[PDB]
Amino acid sequence: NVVYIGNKPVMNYVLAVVTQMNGGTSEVILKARGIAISRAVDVAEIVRNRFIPDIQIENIDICTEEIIGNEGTATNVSAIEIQLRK
C-alpha cells in the first residue's frame, strides 16, 4: 500500500502503482507533499484512464505537515492522500 510521490517522473510512480495492483494488491494510497501534489493527482488519473479502469478513488484528504526545508529550518507544507481501490 502507500506510495509516496516525489521528484521522480510521474510514469515511474504510475508503473509502481500498476505493477502492485496487477500483482494482486487491492489498495494503494498515494501520498504527496507540496509541489508533488499536482503530480499525485496526475498519477491517479493516468492509472485510471490508461491502465486500470475500474479503479475507484475512495477518499481524498488534504492536510498540512511540518518539514525542515532546504534552508535548514522548519516549515509547513500542504499534503495530500489519495486512496485508490480496485
Added chain:
Amino acid sequence: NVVYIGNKPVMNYVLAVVTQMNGGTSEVILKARGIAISRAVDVAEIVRNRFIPDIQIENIDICTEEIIGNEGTATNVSAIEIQLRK
C-alpha cells in the same frame, strides 16, 4: 462562489476566499488544473488553518479535463475541485 486558482500569488486567492466567506457566502468551490492543483490545496489549507478555523472541506473531486489548442491539439489536463463550507 467559484474560484479559479491559477498562478497568481497564493494570497491573492486566499484573500478572495476569506473575504467572500466572511462577508456572507457560506459555500465556495476551489477549482484548478495542472500545476495550479498545488496552489489550490495550499489555498484551502491556509484558509482552514490561518483564517477560518471552522471551515469545512465538503468534497474533493479529481478528474481529467481535455482542452483544444488553437491548432486542434487535444490535451488531457488533471483537474481538481474543492468544496468549502462554513
